Amino acid sequence: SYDRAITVFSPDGHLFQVEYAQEAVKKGSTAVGVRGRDIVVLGVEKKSVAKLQDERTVRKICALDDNVCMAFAGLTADARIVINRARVECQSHRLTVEDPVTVEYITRYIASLKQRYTQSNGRRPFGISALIVGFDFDGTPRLYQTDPSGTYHAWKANAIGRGAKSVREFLEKNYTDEAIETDDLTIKLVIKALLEVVQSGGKNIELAVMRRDQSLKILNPEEIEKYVAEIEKEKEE
Amino acid sequence: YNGGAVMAMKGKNCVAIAADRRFFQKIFPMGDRLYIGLAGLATDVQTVAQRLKFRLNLYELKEGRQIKPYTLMSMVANLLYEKRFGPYYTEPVIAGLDPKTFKPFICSLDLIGCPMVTDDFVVSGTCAEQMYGMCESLWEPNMDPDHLFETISQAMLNAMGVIVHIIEKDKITTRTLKA
Amino acid sequence: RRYDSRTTIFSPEGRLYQVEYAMEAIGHAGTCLGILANDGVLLAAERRNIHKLLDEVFFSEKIYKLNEDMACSVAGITSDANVLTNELRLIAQRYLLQYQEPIPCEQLVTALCDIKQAYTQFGGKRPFGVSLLYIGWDKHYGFQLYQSDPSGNYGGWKATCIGNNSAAAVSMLKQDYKEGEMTLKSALALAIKVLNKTMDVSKLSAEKVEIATLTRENGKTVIRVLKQKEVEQLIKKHEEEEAKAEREK
Amino acid sequence: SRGSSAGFDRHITIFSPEGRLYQVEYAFKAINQGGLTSVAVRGKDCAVIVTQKKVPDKLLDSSTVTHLFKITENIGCVMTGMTADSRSQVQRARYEAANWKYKYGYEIPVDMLCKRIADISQVYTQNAEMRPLGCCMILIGIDEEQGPQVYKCDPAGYYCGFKATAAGVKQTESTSFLEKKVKKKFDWTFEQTVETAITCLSTVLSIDFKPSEIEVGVVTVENPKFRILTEAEIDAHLVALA
Amino acid sequence: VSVYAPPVGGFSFDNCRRNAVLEADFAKRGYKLPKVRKTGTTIAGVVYKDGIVLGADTSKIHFISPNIYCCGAGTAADTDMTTQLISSNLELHSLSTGRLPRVVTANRMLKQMLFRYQGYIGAALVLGGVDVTGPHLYSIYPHGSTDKLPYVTMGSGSLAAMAVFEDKFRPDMEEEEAKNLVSEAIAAGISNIDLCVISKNKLDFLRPYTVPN
Amino acid sequence: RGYSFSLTTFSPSGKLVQIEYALAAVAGGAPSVGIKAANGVVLATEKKQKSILYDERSVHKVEPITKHIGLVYSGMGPDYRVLVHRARKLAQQYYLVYQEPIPTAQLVQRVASVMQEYTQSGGVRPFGVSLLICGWNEGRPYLFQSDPSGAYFAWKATAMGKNYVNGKTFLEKRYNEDLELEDAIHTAILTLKESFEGQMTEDNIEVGICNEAGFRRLTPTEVKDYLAAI
Amino acid sequence: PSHPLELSEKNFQLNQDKMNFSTLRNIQGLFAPLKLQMEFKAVQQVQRLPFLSSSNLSLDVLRGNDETIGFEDILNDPSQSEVMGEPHLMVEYKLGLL
């Protein structure tokens, strides 16, 4: 018991409803983020590609501002509200202070918004988790993660959704200072991490790339196929 | 600041509405055979014209039928009477044909929306007294569209070009005129 | 079950049973169909209020006009559908007043889906048991077709179906839909065939089906509801073509 | 606050499989808790209300025990059911009559007062916080263009106008007796109406009355003011009847 | 308030400051602005034996109920709006009650509604009707004051008409004599003359109320 | 059974049971019929106060809304009264705003919108009534019905209340489109007589009609004359 | 402020309620305004979410405004509002979280 209300403590100090809200996250598509030397890369698995579906309306990578982008895993309808709120808050803070917003600032805002909904029995938490990545004003790449409970952390490489255990196990041993030397190497590392849990070739991969003083760019299927072919050739060699 | 001058005259199965031009919009269409003219402050004219379309579109979507000139008059009067203590500076003029009967209708309102339905002609602006005598002198009943156009053009000219809309059962004629 | 009493409780495996039940409520309604073509969009529905003593007023019973460029069709609870359609019209008029330009279809759908999602998160409220299909045209992407769920989810399709026998209709459309080479006539023929194979009636009749079409002519969008004569002609053509195909064996 | 109680007869806002409101039905059985019966009869130019007086303890001050109330100078009332609920409803009726007079500039009619009370009572049956009152109201008055009036409202929010009605424990027997009498005749003088009411109560209860066991209140066309009879007048009527 | 608060209906006070600046600015630059329509012609009323006679010159005689009529002077829009609102309220009251309304109810409604707005709605009214009690005549002022009198006059030719009444008014007259007196008093102030006659013999207070055409 | 007590709870099959129970409450009321003729509409119902101790001009079940609109109900009277008052206020508001009498369809839509709200919030109860509304607009008659859930339909002829399936069966075979008002009244009274459970009199039924002249409630003398005629 | 009538028109129901409560307390006692306030709160606690228009039927019946039409009912229709905020923000504002 002790799990039928949001604000009831277990006899050993557990809030079980907030923990159940993470089982929804653990059932979404895999998302991987890697922080490079002068580049940041995101990647999301594509699941159940219907024949009569439009792919433009089911994208899981969004641009919060000119230098911040995000990927999510969990309930699809809950992410839209958070994305819109963050988009509005970025411009509000730009009005308040002239300088562009900070990745840590927007992550803290998102975390506080998520935490606000775990305080009363009249509302339910957000069943999503996010990977916020971007560049700072000075030019230092950053990467963050947010939990449904309202906690955030800073990472060098991470994964969410199903298969996160295996993807993180792969990344812990394949993430060195040599694999992040170049943008091509970082993209290859992200694709290799995705390919561990994704079958049916590289046709179920969505990639996003952001560089310094540039905007978010989404790679083409032809470019993804070229990278996959290069990786396969190198592995065969 | 000059304001403007809007006029409307009634003929035989046809109506005419006219406004002056110098060489902002003052006449807006509200239907297939329904027009409204406004004179006064430009900001208030634009605000009223934009707020009337909101209500008209919602009404036509919910009701499922074309609006009548009398109902448009009532809606304009309600919209003007709200904000009675600080008013818009507009003087609407309405002219059009009945969508199902094809009967002429002209009307005039004041600052806060007191209607006035007239059988022969209506005049709005800051020179109503100057144009009232001309309208009374040059108007005769049962006028063909060409005669109506000529007499309304003369009435506008005897008191800087004009624009005249002639509304018929099956056509609308727009003519820009200069003295 | 101890986890399906309200919308504000999670199951141990992370599910929302009240939302699932609301989505299950849609399967009791009539069939609604939508097809996207090269020069128009289509909407076909099934009449459920069939009775000798019922009267015929309004223009349609399941197809509504939202603005000059969009139309929708509902399946579920009529009382909730009325509120949803009124809110859609209000949102479209508000955008038109704000920007002096018509609202895009995806923006309208997202605006309604936010409202639909807000009712599944705050306690003491019952989610809407309605699904909708949207058709329209805009200057950014052209002809479009969307769908919505009681949970607040939407997506863009080329051909889809909601209501009774939705799975069978979707399977048939997927099997016999061509992408990139469809016209309005072929779309109408496919819709007639799918409706005939979907409705559990031995012989299809023109008094239990309504069809609407959207197209562009001379820089204007035209939305019209087909007549019983045209529906009868389409049904007769389909029947004679089926007889010909059977005989040529 | 507390929350609703599960069951088909334990909350006010829950329907049963046959569409009945058992909590509303249970409020009609609280009227019989007191154990008294009321009778109201309308005459040609008068209206009479008769109720039952019971003082069991000898230490009570009998001057403070009553069930006849004065709402307005021209409107009388009799209450059956729970005492505190009856008194609270009398206070609310007085407040509503004052509001009507202030807003409209003339005195409220009996039917309008009854309709307002019933409208207030209807709200309590649709919200999950309030509860219905276990009492029923009967009002009499004189209309300047219509004549005598007799009205009654129920805990469910239903009201109607009658020629003769009853409430309490023996309501059905009183109704049958009054139906027979009205079928036989309906045009009565002032003396015949009060005798009819007293005879109805005596016959139904199978009892011979003393002037200290009943209460009588009347209105008349000649004297529209509500009046409460005294023991001497009640005894005179009883002696004339016997 | 805030953008996060729900909207409410009623009057709007958004253009007050801008108009306050603009009117003075145009005054000290020499330009004209639109104004409001006003009426100030003579209106009168007389209580005769069994009814009310209302007169006005040229319609300015408004409709309140099948037994009550009104006349107004001042801003036309204000009189129209007040009359329409009071007529709708009285129709609702009659539908709820089932009998024809009373003159005192209309007088009280008009008094309270005119007093609520502190005289910013300019409407002076003459009210008359016939009840189950009898004929009554009132006079209401824009600030919310009322007088119950046997004869009243308002408008431009008030002095002459009041003199005519004070010279030639007697109680318990006839219909023709009252009409002639009202017409003479109206003409003493100056078009044509419009008369409204409410009679007790043409009203039935016993039948149930029905919505008039 | 666990989903039979709450109003805001969906059944695992996707059903709302309290609305069904409100409809069951409606189905247990007094019978009422309505027939749309070629030039008018007739509404009939059976009285509740079947006694000599009832004042005739005190409470009525057939009420007018505007000069051209009237309605009858089947269910709970207290719930009917407040809806009648709200409908009257809405009609007056529409007339004040648009300077034109309200059409029947708009009034039905507004009343249904009011009724729908009480089926989606906790701590309240749905209305236990169903309404029949008749009107005359643009030279043609109308007839509508409204459920406790907030849904409305347009009918040519219908019955509701106690024993309404057999009433609809009778109406199906006894109805003709090109029918006058008097024969429509006869058919309505016969349909009501089918399941009266008693002996009809001009003092325990109510009849109202609507035509070009407007809505009007019939007097007992006319009802007695019609009953004698049939 | 801008007009003498703005503040008076904004706060009218509150002043009317205060006057009625004071008169009732002076005439009858402390219990009647208490009961009236509790009924008002109970019937007002149930309604639609703030971004949709409600009807307020029971509250109007309790207050007595079910047979009266004012200028708030025919001018500037709140149901057909020309501006509206986001649903979640409005709901959070009503709860006092903002």
What SS3 string covers chain D? CCCCCCCCCCCCCCCCCCCCCHHHHHCCCCCCCCCCEEEEEECCCEEEEEEECCCCCCCCCHHHCCCEEEEECCEEEEEEECHHHHHHHHHHHHHHHHHHHHHHCCCCCHHHHHHHHHHHHHHCCCCCCCCCCCEEEEEEEEECCCEEEEEEECCCCCEEEECEEEEECCHHHHHHHHHHHHHHCCCCCHHHHHHHHHHHHHHHHCCCCCCCCEEEEEEECCCCCCEECCHHHHHHHHHHHC
Q: How many CB atoms lie within 10 A of CB F108?
A: 23
The 3-class secondary structure across chain E, one letter per residue, is: CCCCCCCCCCCCCCCHHHHHHHHHHHHCCCCCCCCCCEECCCEEEEEECCEEEEEEECCCEEEEECCEEEEEEEEHHHHHHHHHHHHHHHHHHHHHHCCCCCHHHHHHHHHHHHHHCCCCCCEEEEEEEECCCCEEEEEECCCCCEEECCEEEECCCHHHHHHHHHHHCCCCCCHHHHHHHHHHHHHHCCCCEEEEEEECCCCCCCCCCCCCC
**Would you tell me which residues 82-121 of chain A have a C-beta closer than 8 angstroms to some C-beta of chain G?**
84-85, 116
Question: C24, F14: Cβ pair inside 8 Å?
Answer: yes
Inspect the structure and tell me whether chains E and B have 3 or more CB pairs less than 8 Å apart: yes
Domain B1-179, classified CATH 3.60.20.10, yes or no: yes
C99 touches B: beta carbon within 8 Å: no
Least Cα distance to B160 among B127, B136, B121 occurs for B127
> Searching chain G, which residue's CA lies closest to the CA of residue B77?
G75
Q: Which of E41, E42, E79, E83 is catalytic?
A: E41
Could you tell me how many CB contacts below 8 A there are between chain E and chain F? Answer: 21
E133 is known as an active-site residue: no
Give the C-alpha separation, C125 to C18, whole Å. Answer: 11
> What three-state secondary structure class fits A221?
helix
Burial of B36: CB neighbours in 10 Å, binned 0-12, 13-18, 19+: buried
Q: Are A100 and A213 in contact (CB under 8 A)?
A: no
Least Cα distance to E143 among E125, E117, E109 occurs for E117
Give the C-alpha separation, C225 to C73, whole Å. Answer: 13
Intra-chain end-to-end CA distance of chain A, in Å: 57
Which of C21, C52, C56 faces F12 most closely, judged by CB atoms? Answer: C21
Least Cα distance to C27 among C129, C179, C171 occurs for C129
Interface-testing mutation among A10, A54, A83, A121, with chain C (most C C-beta atoms within 10 A): A54
Q: Are F203 and F173 in contact (CB under 8 A)?
A: no
> Searching chain C, which residue's CA lies closest to the CA of residue B62?
C86
Least Cα distance to E163 among E151, E174, E176, E172 occurs for E151
Question: E105, D105: Cβ pair inside 8 Å?
Answer: yes
Beta strand E51-57 with E193-199 is antiparallel
Q: Are E172 and E182 in contact (CB under 8 A)?
A: no
Domain range summary for chain B, segments of one domain joined by +: 1-179
Residues of D with Cβ-Cβ distance to G66 under 8 angstroms: 119
- Burial code (b: 16+ CB inside 10 Å, e: under 16) for B10-31 equals bbeebbbbbbbeeeeebbbebb
List the CATH number of the domain containing F29: 3.60.20.10
C124 touches F: beta carbon within 8 Å: yes
Give the C-alpha separation, C48 to C62, whole Å. Answer: 10
Question: C9, A21: Cβ pair inside 8 Å?
Answer: no
Task: For tokens 């009659």, name the residue.
Answer: E94
B81 touches F: beta carbon within 8 Å: no
G9 touches F: beta carbon within 8 Å: no
Least Cα distance to F159 among F22, F19, F30 occurs for F30
F138 touches B: beta carbon within 8 Å: no
Residues of B with Cβ-Cβ distance to F103 under 8 angstroms: 63
Chains with ≥3 Cβ pairs under 8 A against E? Answer: B, D, F, G
Residues of G with Cβ-Cβ distance to B54 under 8 angstroms: 82
Could you tell me how many CB contacts below 8 A there are between chain A and chain G? Answer: 4
Q: Are D202 and D209 in contact (CB under 8 A)?
A: yes
Domain of residue A41, residue span = 1-237
Q: How many CB atoms lie within 10 A of CB F103?
A: 18
Residues of B with Cβ-Cβ distance to C59 under 8 angstroms: 64
Give the C-alpha separation, A186 to A227, whole Å. Answer: 11
Least Cα distance to G95 among C121, C113, A104 occurs for C121
With vertex at residue E94, the alpha carbon angle to CA E93 and CA E97, rounded to the nearest 5 degrees, is 85
Strands (E), A136-214: 141-146, 152-154, 157-160, 205-211
Experimental method: cryo-EM
E26 to chain G, minimum CA–CA distance in Å?
20
E170 to chain F, minimum CA–CA distance in Å?
41
Give the C-alpha separation, E149 to E165, whole Å. Answer: 12
Domain of residue F185, residue span = 1-230
**Would you tell me which residues 116-155 of chain C have a C-beta closer than 8 angstroms to some C-beta of chain A?**
117, 121-124, 151-155
List the CATH number of the domain containing C132: 3.60.20.10
Question: G74, B85: Cβ pair inside 8 Å?
Answer: no
Interface-testing mutation among F99, F137, F138, with chain B (most B C-beta atoms within 10 A): F99
Give the C-alpha separation, F194 to F1, whole Å. Answer: 37
D96 to chain G, minimum CA–CA distance in Å?
10
Question: B85, G5: Cβ pair inside 8 Å?
Answer: yes
Q: Are E180 and E46 in contact (CB under 8 A)?
A: no
- Residue C174 makes CB contacts below 8 A (sequence gap 6+) with A51, A52, C159
- Burial code (b: 16+ CB inside 10 Å, e: under 16) for G63-89 equals bebbbbbebbbbbbbeebeeebebbbb
Least Cα distance to A33 among A67, A61, A56 occurs for A61
Using a CB cutoff of 8 Å and minimum separation of 24, what contacts does D15-18 make? D15/F18, D15/F21, D15/F22, D15/F24, D15/F25, D15/F125, D15/F126, D15/F128, D16/F21, D17/F4, D17/F21, D17/F24, D18/F21, D18/F24, D18/F25, D18/F28
A80 touches G: beta carbon within 8 Å: no
Expressed in Å, this structure's resolution amounts to 2.7
**Helix and strand tally (H, E) in chain A?**
6, 10
**Helix pair F181-194, F220-229: axis angle to 10 deg:** 80
Domain of residue C217, residue span = 1-247
Task: For tokens 């007294």, name the residue.
Answer: B129
CA quadruple C191, C193, C194, C200: dihedral positive or negative?
positive
Chain F residues near any Cβ of chain G (below 8 Å):
82, 85-86, 89, 92-93, 96-97, 113-114, 117, 120-124
- Phi-psi map region of A80: left, alpha, beta (phi>0 left; psi -120 to 50 alpha): alpha
Least Cα distance to F217 among E207, E101, D119, E102 occurs for E207
Q: Are B108 and B93 in contact (CB under 8 A)?
A: yes
Residues of C with Cβ-Cβ distance to B64 under 8 angstroms: 58-59
Task: Report the DSSP beta bridge partners of residue B15.
Answer: B10, B167
Number of domains in chain A: 1
Residues of E with Cβ-Cβ distance to F66 under 8 angstroms: 211
Which of E99, E108, E206 faces D105 most closely, judged by CB atoms? Answer: E108
Residues of B with Cβ-Cβ distance to F97 under 8 angstroms: 74, 78
For residue E45, report the phi and psi dihedrals to the nearest 5 degrees. -165, 140
Burial of D73: CB neighbours in 10 Å, binned 0-12, 13-18, 19+: exposed
Residues of D with Cβ-Cβ distance to G47 under 8 angstroms: none
In the numeric block, which tokens belong to residue G90? 């409005």
Please state which of the four CATH numbers 3.20.20.80, 3.40.50.300, 3.40.220.10, 3.60.20.10 is assigned to the domain occupying D1-242. Answer: 3.60.20.10
> What three-state secondary structure class fits C125?
strand
Which of F89, F97, F123 faces G46 most closely, judged by CB atoms? Answer: F123
Task: For tokens 């309504």, name the residue.
Answer: C210
Question: D18, F25: Cβ pair inside 8 Å?
Answer: yes
Question: E31, B1: Cβ pair inside 8 Å?
Answer: yes
Give the C-alpha separation, C95 to C232, whole Å. Answer: 40
Which of B40, B81, B83 faces E77 most closely, judged by CB atoms? Answer: B81
In the numeric block, which tokens belong to residue A113? 């918004």
Q: Are A141 and A175 in contact (CB under 8 A)?
A: no
